[PDB]
Structures are given as structure tokens and as C-alpha cells.
Amino acid sequence: EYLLLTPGPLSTSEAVREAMLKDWCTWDDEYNKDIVEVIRTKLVKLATKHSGYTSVLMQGSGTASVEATIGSAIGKEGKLLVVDNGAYGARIAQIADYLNIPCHAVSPGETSQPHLNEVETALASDPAITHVAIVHCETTTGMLNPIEAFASAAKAHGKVVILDAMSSFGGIPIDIAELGIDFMISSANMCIQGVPGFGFVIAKKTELEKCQGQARSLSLDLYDQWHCMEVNHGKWRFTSPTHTVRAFYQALLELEQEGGIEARHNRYQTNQKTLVAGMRSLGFEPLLSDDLHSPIITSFYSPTHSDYQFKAFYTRLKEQGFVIYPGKVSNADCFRIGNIGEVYPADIERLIGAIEKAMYWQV
Amino acid sequence: NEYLLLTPGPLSTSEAVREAMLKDWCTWDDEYNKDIVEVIRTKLVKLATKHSGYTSVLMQGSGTASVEATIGSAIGKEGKLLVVDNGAYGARIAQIADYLNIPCHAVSPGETSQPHLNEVETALASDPAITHVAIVHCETTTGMLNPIEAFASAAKAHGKVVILDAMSSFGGIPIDIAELGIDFMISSANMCIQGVPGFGFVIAKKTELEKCQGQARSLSLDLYDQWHCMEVNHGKWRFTSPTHTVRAFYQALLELEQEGGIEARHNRYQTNQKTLVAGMRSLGFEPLLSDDLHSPIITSFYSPTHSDYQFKAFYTRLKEQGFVIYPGKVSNADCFRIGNIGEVYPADIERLIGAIEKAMYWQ
Numbered sequence: 001e002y003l004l005l006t007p008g009p010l011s012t013s014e015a016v017r018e019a020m021l022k023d024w025c026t027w028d029d030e031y032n033k034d035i036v037e038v039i040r041t042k043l044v045k046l047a048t049k050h051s052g053y054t055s056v057l058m059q060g061s062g063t064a065s066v067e068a069t070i071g072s073a074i075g076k077e078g079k080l081l082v083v084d085n086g087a088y089g090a091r092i093a094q095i096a097d098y099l100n101i102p103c104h105a106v107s108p109g110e111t112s113q114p115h116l117n118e119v120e121t122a123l124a125s126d127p128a129i130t131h132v133a134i135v136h137c138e139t140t141t142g143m144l145n146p147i148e149a150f151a152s153a154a155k156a157h158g159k160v161v162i163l164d165a166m167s168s169f170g171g172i173p174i175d176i177a178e179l180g181i182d183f184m185i186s187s188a189n190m191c192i193q194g195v196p197g198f199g200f201v202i203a204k205k206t207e208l209e210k211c212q213g214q215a216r217s218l219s220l221d222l223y224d225q226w227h228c229m230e231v232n233h234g235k236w237r238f239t240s241p242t243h244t245v246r247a248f249y250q251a252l253l254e255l256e257q258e259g260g261i262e263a264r265h266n267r268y269q270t271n272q273k274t275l276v277a278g279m280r281s282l283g284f285e286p287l288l289s290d291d292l293h294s295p296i297i298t299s300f301y302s303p304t305h306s307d308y309q310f311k312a313f314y315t316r317l318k319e320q321g322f323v324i325y326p327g328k329v330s331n332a333d334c335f336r337i338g339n340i341g342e343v344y345p346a347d348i349e350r351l352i353g354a355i356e357k358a359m360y361w362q363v
Numbered sequence: 364n365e366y367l368l369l370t371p372g373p374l375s376t377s378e379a380v381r382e383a384m385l386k387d388w389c390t391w392d393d394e395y396n397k398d399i400v401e402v403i404r405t406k407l408v409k410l411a412t413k414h415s416g417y418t419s420v421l422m423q424g425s426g427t428a429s430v431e432a433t434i435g436s437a438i439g440k441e442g443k444l445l446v447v448d449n450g451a452y453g454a455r456i457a458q459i460a461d462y463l464n465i466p467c468h469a470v471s472p473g474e475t476s477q478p479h480l481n482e483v484e485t486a487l488a489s490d491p492a493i494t495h496v497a498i499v500h501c502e503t504t505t506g507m508l509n510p511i512e513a514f515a516s517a518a519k520a521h522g523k524v525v526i527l528d529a530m531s532s533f534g535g536i537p538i539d540i541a542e543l544g545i546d547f548m549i550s551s552a553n554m555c556i557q558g559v560p561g562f563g564f565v566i567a568k569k570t571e572l573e574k575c576q577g578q579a580r581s582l583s584l585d586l587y588d589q590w591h592c593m594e595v596n597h598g599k600w601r602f603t604s605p606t607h608t609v610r611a612f613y614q615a616l617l618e619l620e621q622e623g624g625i626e627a628r629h630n631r632y633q634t635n636q637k638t639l640v641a642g643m644r645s646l647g648f649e650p651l652l653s654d655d656l657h658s659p660i661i662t663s664f665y666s667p668t669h670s671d672y673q674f675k676a677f678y679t680r681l682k683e684q685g686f687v688i689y690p691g692k693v694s695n696a697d698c699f700r701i702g703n704i705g706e707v708y709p710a711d712i713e714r715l716i717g718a719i720e721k722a723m724y725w726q
């Protein structure tokens with residue numbers, strides 16, 4: 001019943017959920033070859049039109065895939081450069097800390113875009129960096145980060161590039177081979193519009209090969225997981241979330257049917273721009289300037305009316321069939337509205353009407 | 364439902380457990396965290412013990428991620444593990460300790476043998492550096508039921524922390540983890556509870572779980588941090604959880620209560636397993652283990668010694684009749700397995716025995 005205006009888990013189509021009504025055996029080819037290997041093939045082609053890439057699927061939250069990448073790719077003498085401008089870049093630094101990996105972090109603040117000169121300066125002044133981690137859509141605020149110039153700078157400096165594309169892959173066109181991304185992480189449940197249960201890594205095969213024997217976790221051993229899928233035709237070393245994987249297979253078919261990432265991006269971009277215009281017509285201000293907006297999720301300042309309360313606003317909107325999202329900026333009073341999943345222009349129009357009816361602090 | 368999965372899990376789930384997945388949830392909303400997650404947590408502790416002092420943590424990923432979260436979070440920098448290795452899951456515990464650089468002494472009596480309490484006792488007495496012990500309750504490798512009471516009792520007498528891998532027993536074999544002196548019991552969403560895969564869980568003695576704070580070797584698998592967030596944020600999972608699989612689990616817990624609880628499920632499983640063994644013997648099949656070592660969960664049988672017998676051909680012929688059996692997992696034994704859990708009833712075992720006979724192409 002609710003329309004979830006979240007970044008994911010979000011409102012999935014009826015067919016994506018119905019695809020979960022079948023049980024699968026984890027040791028049978030009908031699952032491994034017919035479902036898993038197909039997802040792997042499709043994911044690589046979605047990420048790039050070029051050769052040399054491969055995919056690995058990993059059980060757990062998308063954070064477990066980010067952690068599997070960091071912990072498996074970085075050697076004993078490695079150092080990670082993190083571009084931190086929100087919770088996800090900060091979480092990458094936190095993973096490095098847990099795994100005792102030295103970290104250089106450029107942290108301009110949660111509402112600031114990192115400048116190319118900041119990444120270039122870190123690379124030029126710290127030769128110990130071996131790896132660079134960047135976030136494509138910083139979901140914290142919904143900022144769209146300029147990943148091309150950062151990846152380009154890192155590659156020119158001979159670094160391995162890790163991209164957290166959790167909230168962008170499948171909704172924002174990117175060719176990870178052209179961008180020079182060595183490891184791209186993304187989610188089953190955001191722009192692809194599947195359900196949560198696993199994440200995945202699309203990696204340059206020669207870079208993934210270097211991960212062998214370097215892992216800091218058995219569950220999160222990226223090369224071991226990949227090797228098993230490679231030689232055992234899709235087999236996950238340990239139990240996988242079968243139903244969610246089959247839902248993902250369905251989500252990939254619906255993305256092809258929509259017209260691919262280009263068509264999905266166009267829908268998302270139209271939803272986001274329509275939402276921003278609608279919100280401005282009601283007196284809401286986006287937290288970020290329009291040039292920094294992603295087409296995925298948008299942060300808005302909380303109304304400054306003395307009677308405004310997020311909980312009361314959230315409840316009134318839920319009563320009208322819409323679930324909005326908490327702000328994630330520690331120094332700003334804000335909220336978020338995603339426009340992905342089963343969200344179409346007609347939904348944005350109904351939403352704007354519902355937000356006006358939920359503005360209890362105004363006649 | 365083309366097949367009945369005679370696997371240890373993922374298995375054949377009820378229609379209501381799968382139908383429960385047809386709803387989307389917001390990971391930041393109380394209708395999911397308080398109404399679904401906190402209820403599962405409360406129910407899981409009461410299922411594990413009738414006593415106070417215990418708590419639960421849910422962890423995204425395979426059950427292995429939960430075992431690894433326990434080992435990596437519970438064991439300090441100077442800790443040492445004693446593990447009984449009498450199958451693949453005891454061996455995997457030793458492998459996790461190796462990945463995490465945790466000193467580990469394995470007691471390996473063989474995969475068709477129960478650990479000798481004298482060897483365990485001697486290993487404990489002669490090595491005061493051991494801080495932790497681990498054992499697998501139902502060794503799914505063979506379907507062996509391990510003697511956990513005497514093992515846990517010996518470890519407790521030696522002042523050790525007891526870890527129980529009850530992946531394939533919890534919910535199908537009556538146990539009171541407080542009475543047994545288990546400090547951490549790991550189990551999964553998709554075995555005797557009959558949910559779908561997606562997450563595992565740990566039921567721990569609260570005072571023991573508290574010692575895990577700050578000791579974790581993984582952010583994703585930080586047991587105390589995951590628990591603390593669920594405790595103070597009313598069910599909130601730090602990172603995205605497999606919502607649909609969690610809601611399916613909530614439904615699986617209701618169906619276990621409706622069945623008559625662990626006592627009734629155990630009785631069904633015991634009857635299934637004993638009926639299956641008698642049926643298999645009538646066809647000339649020999650179980651790997653002596654009857655006194657059988658768990659009521661899954662049974663391993665020796666491969667027929669006919670020169671034309673091949674597991675793949677037998678497996679296919681059974682699939683054609685609507686049954687999915689399971690490959691053998693024993694070191695130095697040619698064998699196969701048949702689970703009798705999930706939506707498996709006496710009438711299914713009877714149909715299975717008929718189907719096994721029709722699949723005996725070499726006779």
C-alpha cells in the first residue's frame with residue numbers, strides 16, 4: 001500500500017515480489033546456471049560495453065560488499081585514499097580502520113562537493129596510497145559526486161579505483177571500464193529495483209585476481225567467492241538468499257523492458273526535477289544547490305515553523321500513502337525524498353498534493 | 364512447487380512463509396523495526412531458553428557470516444579457540460579462526476565419529492591459553508547429532524566461553540541454551556525454523572555478548588555493534604536488512620508456534636527421519652552412521668556399490684519424480700544425503716521411498 005520514497009529498500013514491482021514465490025536448491029543448476037550465471041553476465045554488460053570485467057555476488061548488506069572489496073583488494077602494505085563527503089565515504093574510512101588498513105581521507109564536509117584539486121593534492125603528496133575509494137551518489141544528501149575526474153586522477157597516479165555506486169548503478173549511466181574503475185560496488189535494492197539480500201562487485205578481472213589470498217574475512221573473501229562462481233557455474237560458497245536473487249533476475253528483466261539504464265535515468269531525472277519544482281511551489285528549499293543534485297534522492301531543509309516536527313509530518317504523509325525519509329546531515333535540520341523504485345510522474349504529482357495536505361502548520 | 368527439496372535448507376517453505384514476502388518495508392520505519400524485527404528477537408530468545416539473561420542479534424548474510432561474526436567479535440586479541448572438527452562446519456570454524464589469525468586447536472575424531480570427551484578434557488586441561496570452545500550441534504555433513512551437553516559442561520568447568528553452531532538443529536531439536544551453558548548459539552533463518560535464507564542470528568548470554576564491544580574484526584560482522592543498534596534503536600539493523608526474508612521469518616515463527624513448537628516439530632522430524640531410514644534400508648541402502656548417532660534432520664547413505672550407479676543419474680531420476688536429494692559431503696566416503704525438514708510430512712516420505720525405488724535404474 002505505501003509508496004516508499006526511500007533510496008532502497010523501496011517499492012518494488014508486483015512481478016519482482018511474485019518472483020520470490022519459488023524455492024530453490026543452492027546446489028542445483030536450475031538456480032546456479034539458469035539464475036545466478038545469467039545475473040552475473042547481465043550485470044557486467046550493464047556496467048560496461050568493454051571486455052576485461054567480471055562480477056561477484058555477495059550475501060548481506062551492500063556495506064558487506066564494500067567491506068569485502070576493501071578487505072580483499074588491499075594488501076598488507078596498502079593505503080586507502082577515501083573521498084568522504086557523507087556517511088558512506090565515512091563508513092569506507094571506518095571499514096579501513098576496523099581492518100587496520102592505513103587511510104588518507106579527504107573530508108570536505110557532508111554538504112560540500114570534494115574538489116578535484118583535493119584528490120590530486122592527496123595523491124601528489126602521499127605516495128603510500130595504493131587505493132582510492134569514491135562514492136558516486138552520496139545518498140546522505142543525494143549529492144552527485146564527479147567520479148570521472150577523481151578516477152582519472154587516481155589512474156594517472158597508478159592507484160586501484162574502488163567506486164561505491166550503491167545508489168547510482170542502474171539509475172545513472174556509467175561505463176566503469178571507460179571511467180577506469182577497478183571495483184564497482186552496488187546493491188540489489190536501489191536503482192536496479194530488486195529486493196535486499198545481497199550486493200555485488202563488478203571488477204576488472206586482472207584486478208580481482210590480485211585479491212587471491214589477501215582477504216581478511218572468510219565470508220567476505222571476494223576472490224574466493226568469485227573463484228567458486230567461476231569454476232562451479234554460479235555456485236555461492238555458502239547459502240545465498242535464493243528468493244532475493246530470483247527477484248533480482250526479475251528486476252534485471254524489467255530494467256531491459258524499460259529501455260535500460262538510459263530510460264531509467266530519464267524517468268529518475270524527470271521524477272527528481274518534478275519533485276524539486278513541486279516542493280519549491282510549497283515553500284520547501286533543497287538542502288543542496290540544483291547543480292549538485294543526483295536524480296535519486298533529494299534532501300530538503302526542514303520547515304522553520306515552530307510547530308513543524310518530522311515525526312508528525314512523516315505520519316501525516318504515511319496516512320496518505322507515502323513514506324518519506326529522515327535527514328542524514330548532522331549539522332542541518334533536513335529530510336529526504338527518494339524518487340526511485342515504482343515511482344512515476346503521476347506519483348510525484350500525487351505526492352506534492354499529499355505533502356500540501358500534510359503541512360499541518362499551514363492553513 | 365515443482366520439487367520437494369530434501370535438503371538441509373534452503374528448503375521447501377510453506378505457501379504463507381513465501382506469501383509473507385509480497386510486502387515492501389522501509390528499513391527506517393517502526394512498522395518493520397518494532398512490529399517485525401523486535402518480535403522475532405523476543406520470540407527467538409524464548410525459543411532458545413525458558414531462562415533470563417539471554418538476548419538475540421540478527422545478522423545479514425549466510426549463517427557462516429553469523430558464525431564468523433561470533434568468532435571474530437567474541438574472541439579477544441589474546442584468545443584461543445578449541446573446536447571439534449567432525450565435519451565441514453567444524454572445519455569451517457577452524458578456517459574462520461585461521462582467516463582471523465585466532466590460534467585454534469582442532470579436535471578431529473573423524474567425520475563419522477563423535478568427539479571423544481577425554482581428548483577435549485585433555486586439550487582443555489593441558490592448554491590454559493584456550494579461552495573459547497566451539498562445537499556443531501547437528502553436523503549436517505553426515506547428519507550426525509554431536510554430544511553438546513557434556514562438551515559444554517567440560518568447557519564451563521574449565522571457565523571457557525561456549526560457542527554452539529546450531530545452524531541445522533535450532534528449532535527442530537529441543538535445547539535450552541541457558542541450561543546447557545551455551546554462551547553464543549548461532550542458527551539460521553532457513554533450516555528447522557523453515558524460513559527463507561537472507562540472515563542468520565546469534566542467541567547469546569547478555570553478559571558474554573557485552574564483552575564483544577570493541578573487539579570485532581569486521582564492521583559488517585561486529586556482533587556487539589549490531590546488537591547495540593537493535594537494542595537502543597528498537598530493532599533497527601545498522602545497514603540494510605533483507606526485509607522480505609525477515610518478514611518471511613516472522614511468518615515461519617508463527618507457523619512453528621501453530622505446529623505446537625519445537626517439541627511438535629522435533630516429533631515430526633524424528634518420525635520423518637526414522638521412517639526414511641527404514642524405507643532406505645528396505646531398498647538396500649546403508650546409512651553412514653550407526654542409528655544412535657543420527658540427528659532427526661538429514662541422513663547420509665553410502666552410495667550403492669553397483670558399477671552403473673552414478674549420483675548425477677540417480678539425482679536426475681529423482682528430480683523427474685518431484686524430489687531433490689543432496690550430494691554427499693564426507694571426507695573419504697562416497698555418499699549422498701536426504702534431508703527430511705521443511706514441508707516434509709510422513710506422506711512425503713512414503714512417496715519418496717516409492718520414488719527412490721523407481722530411480723534405482725541399476726536394479
Ligand SMILES: Cc1ncc(COP(=O)(O)O)c(CNCCP(=O)(O)O)c1O
Nearest residue numbers: 007061062063088139164166167602603
Ligand atoms: C552510497 C551508499 N553506500 C553504501 C550504502 C550501504 O548499503 P547497505 O545499507 O549496507 O545495503 C548505502 C545505503 N543507503 C540506503 C540505506 P540507509 O539505511 O539509508 O543507509 C548507500 O546509499
Ligand SMILES: Cc1ncc(COP(=O)(O)O)c(CNCCP(=O)(O)O)c1O
Nearest residue numbers: 238239371425426427452503528530531
Ligand atoms: C551446521 C552448519 N553450520 C553452518 C552452515 C553454513 O550455513 P550457510 O550456508 O552459511 O547459511 C551450515 C549449512 N548447511 C546447509 C547449506 P550447505 O551449502 O549444504 O553447506 C550448516 O549445516
Ligand SMILES: [Cl-]
Nearest residue numbers: 383386399610
Ligand atoms: Cl504484514
